Paper text:
BRDT is a tissue-restricted, chromatin-associated protein expressed in pachytene spermatocytes, diplotene spermatocytes, and round spermatids (Shang et al., 2007).
The mode of binding of (+)-JQ1 to BRDT(1) was established by X-ray crystallography at high-resolution. The observed, extraordinary shape complementarity between (+)-JQ1 and BRDT(1) explains the increased potency of (+)-JQ1 compared to the physiologic H4Kac4 ligand. Biochemical and crystallographic studies confirm that occupancy of the BRDT acetyl-lysine binding pocket by JQ1 prevents recognition of acetylated histone H4.
Numbering used by the authors: 29 to 134
Protein backbone atom coordinates (compact mmCIF):
# COMPACT_ATOMS: atom_id res chain seq x y z
CA UNK A 1 0.00 0.00 0.00
CA UNK A 2 3.07 2.28 0.05
CA UNK A 3 3.72 1.36 -3.57
CA UNK A 4 0.14 0.84 -4.77
CA UNK A 5 -0.40 4.50 -3.66
CA UNK A 6 2.55 5.61 -5.80
CA UNK A 7 1.08 3.76 -8.79
CA UNK A 8 -2.25 5.54 -8.17
CA UNK A 9 -1.18 9.08 -7.35
CA UNK A 10 1.97 9.24 -9.47
CA UNK A 11 2.24 6.60 -12.25
CA UNK A 12 -1.37 6.37 -13.29
CA UNK A 13 -1.88 10.13 -12.95
CA UNK A 14 1.06 10.96 -15.21
CA UNK A 15 0.17 8.39 -17.78
CA UNK A 16 -3.41 9.56 -17.72
CA UNK A 17 -2.50 13.22 -18.33
CA UNK A 18 -0.01 12.46 -21.10
CA UNK A 19 -1.51 13.33 -24.46
CA UNK A 20 -0.98 9.81 -25.83
CA UNK A 21 -3.19 8.32 -23.07
CA UNK A 22 -6.55 8.77 -24.79
CA UNK A 23 -6.88 5.41 -26.62
CA UNK A 24 -6.14 3.68 -23.33
CA UNK A 25 -8.49 5.59 -21.00
CA UNK A 26 -11.47 3.30 -21.60
CA UNK A 27 -11.98 -0.26 -22.71
CA UNK A 28 -11.90 -0.75 -26.52
CA UNK A 29 -15.37 -0.12 -27.88
CA UNK A 30 -15.40 -2.79 -30.60
CA UNK A 31 -18.78 -1.72 -32.02
CA UNK A 32 -17.79 1.96 -32.39
CA UNK A 33 -14.34 1.11 -33.79
CA UNK A 34 -15.78 -1.70 -35.91
CA UNK A 35 -13.34 -4.36 -34.59
CA UNK A 36 -15.48 -7.53 -34.39
CA UNK A 37 -12.31 -9.61 -33.93
CA UNK A 38 -10.85 -7.59 -31.06
CA UNK A 39 -12.17 -9.37 -27.98
CA UNK A 40 -11.39 -12.76 -29.58
CA UNK A 41 -7.79 -11.88 -30.21
CA UNK A 42 -7.37 -10.06 -26.88
CA UNK A 43 -8.43 -12.43 -24.09
CA UNK A 44 -7.17 -10.34 -21.19
CA UNK A 45 -8.30 -6.84 -22.12
CA UNK A 46 -6.90 -4.04 -19.96
CA UNK A 47 -7.11 -0.25 -19.87
CA UNK A 48 -6.32 2.63 -17.58
CA UNK A 49 -9.85 3.06 -16.24
CA UNK A 50 -9.92 -0.57 -15.22
CA UNK A 51 -6.58 -0.18 -13.54
CA UNK A 52 -7.91 2.95 -11.78
CA UNK A 53 -11.25 1.49 -10.72
CA UNK A 54 -9.19 -1.47 -9.43
CA UNK A 55 -6.91 0.79 -7.34
CA UNK A 56 -9.97 2.83 -6.06
CA UNK A 57 -11.77 -0.33 -4.87
CA UNK A 58 -8.59 -2.07 -3.56
CA UNK A 59 -8.67 -5.02 -5.95
CA UNK A 60 -4.92 -5.54 -5.78
CA UNK A 61 -3.06 -7.56 -3.20
CA UNK A 62 0.39 -6.34 -4.34
CA UNK A 63 2.23 -3.68 -6.42
CA UNK A 64 3.48 -6.44 -8.81
CA UNK A 65 -0.07 -7.27 -9.81
CA UNK A 66 -0.91 -3.71 -10.75
CA UNK A 67 2.30 -3.52 -12.81
CA UNK A 68 1.30 -6.66 -14.76
CA UNK A 69 -2.01 -5.01 -15.76
CA UNK A 70 -0.11 -2.05 -17.19
CA UNK A 71 2.06 -4.48 -19.12
CA UNK A 72 -0.94 -6.38 -20.43
CA UNK A 73 -2.39 -3.14 -21.59
CA UNK A 74 0.71 -2.45 -23.68
CA UNK A 75 1.24 -6.03 -24.88
CA UNK A 76 -2.41 -6.15 -25.97
CA UNK A 77 -1.76 -3.15 -28.18
CA UNK A 78 1.35 -4.81 -29.75
CA UNK A 79 -0.43 -8.11 -30.33
CA UNK A 80 -3.55 -6.62 -32.01
CA UNK A 81 -1.77 -3.93 -34.08
CA UNK A 82 1.44 -3.88 -36.33
CA UNK A 83 4.89 -2.30 -35.98
CA UNK A 84 4.90 1.26 -37.22
CA UNK A 85 1.19 1.80 -36.48
CA UNK A 86 0.47 5.18 -34.89
CA UNK A 87 -1.19 3.36 -31.95
CA UNK A 88 1.93 1.23 -31.41
CA UNK A 89 4.17 4.35 -31.29
CA UNK A 90 1.87 5.95 -28.75
CA UNK A 91 1.94 2.79 -26.63
CA UNK A 92 5.72 2.54 -26.79
CA UNK A 93 6.06 6.13 -25.61
CA UNK A 94 3.66 5.61 -22.77
CA UNK A 95 5.55 2.48 -21.93
CA UNK A 96 8.84 4.46 -21.74
CA UNK A 97 7.24 7.01 -19.41
CA UNK A 98 5.87 4.13 -17.35
CA UNK A 99 9.27 2.48 -16.80
CA UNK A 100 10.74 5.93 -16.03
CA UNK A 101 8.25 6.27 -13.17
CA UNK A 102 8.67 2.68 -11.96
CA UNK A 103 12.37 3.35 -11.57
CA UNK A 104 11.53 6.00 -8.96
CA UNK A 105 9.07 3.89 -6.92
CA UNK A 106 9.43 3.42 -3.10
C1 LIG B 1 -10.35 4.73 -29.03
C2 LIG B 1 -9.25 3.75 -29.58
S1 LIG B 1 -8.75 2.32 -28.70
C3 LIG B 1 -7.58 1.89 -29.88
C4 LIG B 1 -7.59 2.82 -30.94
C5 LIG B 1 -8.56 3.82 -30.75
C6 LIG B 1 -8.72 4.89 -31.80
C7 LIG B 1 -6.75 2.76 -32.09
C8 LIG B 1 -6.02 3.89 -32.59
C9 LIG B 1 -5.68 4.93 -31.74
C10 LIG B 1 -4.95 6.01 -32.18
C11 LIG B 1 -4.53 6.11 -33.51
CL1 LIG B 1 -3.65 7.56 -33.89
C12 LIG B 1 -4.79 5.07 -34.39
C13 LIG B 1 -5.55 3.97 -33.92
N1 LIG B 1 -6.49 1.59 -32.69
C14 LIG B 1 -7.14 0.33 -32.30
C15 LIG B 1 -6.89 -0.72 -33.39
C16 LIG B 1 -7.56 -0.16 -34.65
O1 LIG B 1 -7.23 -0.48 -35.77
O2 LIG B 1 -8.54 0.76 -34.52
C17 LIG B 1 -9.03 1.43 -35.72
C18 LIG B 1 -9.71 0.50 -36.75
C19 LIG B 1 -7.87 2.18 -36.39
C20 LIG B 1 -10.07 2.39 -35.14
C21 LIG B 1 -6.64 -0.01 -30.89
N2 LIG B 1 -5.93 -1.07 -30.49
N3 LIG B 1 -5.73 -1.00 -29.24
C22 LIG B 1 -6.30 0.15 -28.79
C23 LIG B 1 -6.31 0.63 -27.38
N4 LIG B 1 -6.85 0.77 -29.82
Amino acid sequence: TNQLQYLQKVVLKDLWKHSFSWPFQRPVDAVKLQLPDYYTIIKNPMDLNTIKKRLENKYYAKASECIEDFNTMFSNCYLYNKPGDDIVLMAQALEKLFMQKLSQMP
